[PDB]
Design goal:
Elements: E1 2-7, E2 10-13, E3 18-26, E4 31-39, E5 46-52, E6 57-59, E7 67-72, E8 77-82, E9 91-102, E10 107-113, E11 117-122
Length: 123
Amino acid sequence: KVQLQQSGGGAVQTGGSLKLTCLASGNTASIRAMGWYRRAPGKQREWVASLTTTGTADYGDFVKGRFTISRDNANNAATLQMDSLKPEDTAVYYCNADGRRFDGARWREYESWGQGTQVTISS
């Protein structure tokens, strides 16, 4: 169907920047939105950012203008540019894709996930 591969993890000092990349393969025409989630230490996964196919970007409350999500048709990729990082941003970040696919009988909503990219930010 739709597969995702993630890269761009690292460890940086407070104030630094990182970029996450997510490459989609397979039925990428079916993708309605790509997004980023994260799991901070000992917490549950939380929503970070989404970008719909028509170009509407939304961000979690903790983002505060510091991260930028973009999508590239040429590479069927989504990216998260992360600036002004803080220890609180330490987490495993997961790429996701939402869309609708035809299973041969009905249209079905799907969600695909990457395997997660480690991010560490220390004071």
